[PDB]
């Protein structure tokens, strides 16, 4: 596989590559913080997407019933 699994695998790749590169740990700690934010964001975006879609279906339904 899904969007989430591919993005975890790519994060895992990138993180390894940068460690081999000697990347300063403050930059790596920041990237780790960003990764967490992006994973959290995906869960919240999906909640919002599902609720939004149901809201719009209900608005349509209520316009037909009124």
């Amino acid at each position: 596989a899904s969007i989430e699994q591919l993005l975890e695998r790519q994060w895992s790749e990138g993180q390894q590559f940068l460690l081999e590169q000697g990347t300063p740990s403050d930059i790596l700690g920041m990237l780790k913080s960003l990764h967490q934010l992006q994973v959290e964001n995906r869960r919240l975006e999906e909640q919002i997407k599902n609720l939004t879609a149901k809201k719009e279906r209900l608005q349509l339904l209520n316009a037909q019933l009124s």
Binding site: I27, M30, L31, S33, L34, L37, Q38, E40, N41, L44, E45, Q47, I48, L51, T52, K54, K55, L58, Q59, L61, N62, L65, S66
Partner: protein, 50 residues
């Protein structure tokens, strides 16, 4: 530079996620209003059928 870009991305996504937590609550309320309205409109259409 790339450092400053990352700090800014962190702030933006942090802010966006807090907006989405608030929007979840709004949308939950929107749904309760909508379902309540659905029930009222359905009942009224059922009344006209007789």
């Amino acid at each position: 530079g790339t450092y400053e870009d990352l700090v800014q991305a962190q702030k933006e996504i942090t802010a966006h996620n807090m907006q989405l937590r608030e929007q979840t609550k709004q949308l939950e309320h929107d749904m309760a209003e909508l379902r309540d309205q659905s029930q009222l409109l359905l009942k009224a259409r059922c009344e006209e059928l007789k």
